[PDB]
Structure formats: C-alpha cells, structure tokens
Amino acid sequence: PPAVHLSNGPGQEPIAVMTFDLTKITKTSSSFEVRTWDPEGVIFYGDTNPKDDWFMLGLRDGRPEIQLHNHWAQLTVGAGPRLDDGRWHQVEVKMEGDSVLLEVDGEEVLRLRQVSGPLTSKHPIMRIALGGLLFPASNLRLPLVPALDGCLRRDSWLDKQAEISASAPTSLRSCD
Amino acid sequence: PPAVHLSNGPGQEPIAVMTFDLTKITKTSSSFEVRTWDPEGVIFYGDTNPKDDWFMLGLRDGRPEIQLHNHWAQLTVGAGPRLDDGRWHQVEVKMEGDSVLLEVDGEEVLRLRQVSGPLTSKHPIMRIALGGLLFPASNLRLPLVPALDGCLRRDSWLDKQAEISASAPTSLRSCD
Ligand SMILES: C[C@]12CC[C@H](O)C[C@@H]1CC[C@@H]1[C@@H]2CC[C@]2(C)[C@H](O)CC[C@@H]12
Numbered sequence: 001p002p003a004v005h006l007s008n009g010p011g012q013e014p015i016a017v018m019t020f021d022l023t024k025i026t027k028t029s030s031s032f033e034v035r036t037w038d039p040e041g042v043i044f045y046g047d048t049n050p051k052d053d054w055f056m057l058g059l060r061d062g063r064p065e066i067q068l069h070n071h072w073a074q075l076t077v078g079a080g081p082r083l084d085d086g087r088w089h090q091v092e093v094k095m096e097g098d099s100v101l102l103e104v105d106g107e108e109v110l111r112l113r114q115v116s117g118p119l120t121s122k123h124p125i126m127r128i129a130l131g132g133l134l135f136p137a138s139n140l141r142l143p144l145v146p147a148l149d150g151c152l153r154r155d156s157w158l159d160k161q162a163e164i165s166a167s168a169p170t171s172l173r174s175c176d
Numbered sequence: 177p178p179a180v181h182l183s184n185g186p187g188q189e190p191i192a193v194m195t196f197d198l199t200k201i202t203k204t205s206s207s208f209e210v211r212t213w214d215p216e217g218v219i220f221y222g223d224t225n226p227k228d229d230w231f232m233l234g235l236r237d238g239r240p241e242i243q244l245h246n247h248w249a250q251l252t253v254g255a256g257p258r259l260d261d262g263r264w265h266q267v268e269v270k271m272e273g274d275s276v277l278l279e280v281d282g283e284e285v286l287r288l289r290q291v292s293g294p295l296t297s298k299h300p301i302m303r304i305a306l307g308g309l310l311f312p313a314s315n316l317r318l319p320l321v322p323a324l325d326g327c328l329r330r331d332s333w334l335d336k337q338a339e340i341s342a343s344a345p346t347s348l349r350s351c352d
Pocket residue numbers: 028029030045046047048053054055068069070093094095100116126158
C-alpha cells in the first residue's frame with residue numbers, strides 16, 4: 001500500500017487540502033492507517049469556517065487528541081491508547097447522529113456527544129487538511145506543535161463524489 | 177473487601193452523599209472498583225452547585241460517560257472499553273492541572289482538558305453522590321436512566337480530612 005509522509009520537513013503547513021461540497025455529501029466518515037514515533041502533531045484538520053467552525057485530530061503525549069470549535073461545542077479532549085509505537089494503526093472518525101466518534105484499531109475509544117447538527121444542512125463547503133492546520137497553531141484552543149513525523153496510507157476522506165478539489169502546497173513524499 | 181450495591185431497588189436516588197470543604201481539600205482524586213452487567217446508569221455525581229457547577233460519571237452502552245457543566249465547559253463524552261462484563265474494574269477520576277482525567281484498569285482512557293480552574297479557589301462546598309444524581313435525570317445534558325445495578329468496593333473519595341459529612345437516604349446493602 002502506498003504510504004505518504006505526514007509532514008514535509010519543517011512541517012508548518014498541511015501536505016494536502018481537500019475541499020468538499022457539503023450538500024453533496026452522503027458519507028461523513030473518514031478512515032486511514034497511521035504509523036509514527038512522534039508523540040505530538042496534527043494528523044488532520046477540518047473546517048467549514050476557520051473562524052468559528054473547525055476540528056482537529058492529532059496526537060499529544062502519544063495519544064489521540066481532538067479539538068473542536070463550533071456553534072454547539074468547544075472542547076479539547078484526549079483519549080485512546082498511545083499510537084506513537086511505530087506500528088500501523090487503523091483510525092476512523094465519523095458522525096453518528098449529533099456525535100463525533102473516534103475508533104482506533106477497530107475499537108471505539110471516544111464519542112463526543114451533542115457536538116453537531118447535520119453537516120449537509122447549516123457552511124456549504126468543508127475543507128480537510130492533512131498533517132497541518134489552516135490557521136496558526138497559536139489559534140488552537142490548546143496549542144501544540146503541528147509537525148507530525150509519521151506515515152499515512154489507505155486513507156478515505158468523507159465522500160469522494162462530493163470532493164470539489166484537492167491541492168498540495170508541495171509534493172507528496174513516499175514512506176518508501 | 178466489603179462491596180456495596182450501587183442502587184437500592186428502584187434506583188431513583190443516590191445510596192450515599194458526602195459533603196466536603198473545598199478549602200480543606202489536599203487530594204482531588206477519587207478511585208474505586210466497580211462490577212456490573214448493567215449497560216446504563218450513574219456511578220457517581222458531584223457538584224458545588226446543582227444549578228451550574230456539576231459532574232456525572234456513568235455508563236452508557238456499557239462504556240464510561242462523563243457529563244460536566246461549569247463556567248468553563250459543558251460536555252457529554254463517552255470513552256474507554258465496556259465495563260458491563262461482570263468483572264471488577266479499577267476506576268480513577270482525578271484533576272491534573274485544568275484537566276479531568278479518567279483511568280480504567282490502570283490505563284488513561286480519557287482526558288478532558290481546559291475544563292476547570294482550581295477547586296479550592298473559586299463554591300466552598302462539594303457534594304459527591306453515589307449511584308444517583310442530586311437533580312432529576314431529565315436535567316442532565318443528555319438524560320439516561322440513573323439506576324445502576326452494580327457493586328462498588330475499595331472506594332476513596334477526594335480528601336477524607338476534608339469530608340464534612342456523609343448521609344444515606346436508606347441503608348447500604350452488601351454485595352454478599
Ligand atoms: C469530524 C468531521 C465529521 C467526520 C469526518 O470524517 C471529518 C469531519 C472534519 C470536520 C468536522 C466534522 C464534524 C463537525 C465539525 C466539528 C464542525 O462542522 C466544524 C468542523 C467539522
């Protein structure tokens with residue numbers, strides 16, 4: 001399976017940004033495998049508005065951390081086992097009703113309830129950035145250093161049929 | 177080890193309530209072992225004010241759930257493995273800086289960050305209720321049925337030297 005580097009050297013910007021049409025979304029889940037020895041960094045960021053409608057999934061002290069900021073909730077939460085053990089880990093992030101669910105290696109490790117209304121409704125465009133944020137780290141509810149020295153593979157983001165475009169500030173590097 | 181029943185039949189009220197002097201608190205952690213086959217219910221509730229300063233640790237679909245409502249945060253979060261497997265489980269809830277940490281069987285499974293300022297400061301009295309709430313379940317951010325058919329043992333609550341009093345609406349029942 002082709003795996004890409006989650007950061008390009010300095011690691012101050014995402015390695016890729018995908019834009020989606022929310023009205024066209026039929027699938028809200030995202031999944032991928034990640035491998036790393038890095039205990040802190042951004043795995044992926046998502047927003048409909050960088051100002052007041054955003055989400056971040058990363059690692060802090062080796063464990064998953066989600067920061068979320070929207071009309072219904074504002075939170076900084078850590079959960080799950082350490083993932084900075086150099087092994088491949090399966091990760092899934094999905095919407096289940098008004099909740100955001102995080103599954104690690106097939107097991108649910110965190111369910112953030114009552115945090116969102118329907119995506120398609122309410123913010124017609126959603127952006128997903130890998131390995132970086134779309135705003136300064138200092139703007140996070142709880143700052144961390146975004147650079148994540150790890151590998152990503154077998155990734156699936158939301159609904160491909162709803163993807164408007166994809167960019168890369170530079171060029172994706174292989175973990176081979 | 178003497179174990180007590182976490183609910184008395186109907187299970188509409190706590191089996192015990194302990195009151196503490198916050199200014200006297202030197203230890204903020206609580207720990208205990210719980211065993212149960214019940215997938216939903218309140219393990220313990222805590223507040224400094226039932227109106228706007230409260231906390232609840234329970235089970236929903238077999239897994240730990242924390243609801244918290246205070247000046248800094250308002251949340252409903254599920255985490256950790258199922259605990260309704262009839263085995264004894266060690267549980268710890270503690271303050272670590274501005275965070276509330278939940279450990280299950282020796283492993284950190286959830287860290288709610290940026291949710292509280294110093295306890296001793298800011299609410300001079302804290303109440304801890306076991307197996308029930310100190311307000312209607314309908315008043316929870318996300319209602320659940322409080323009755324938890326399980327056993328509790330080896331419990332330690334905050335700082336005993338700060339305990340003002342303890343009550344029991346009825347009488348503690350043994351799991352023997
Ligand atoms: C987590 C998820 C959904 C599952 C999907 O796999 C990834 C996206 C990323 C953006 C989140 C959204 C959930 C709703 C959020 C928190 C708000 O609307 C602001 C940003 C949004």
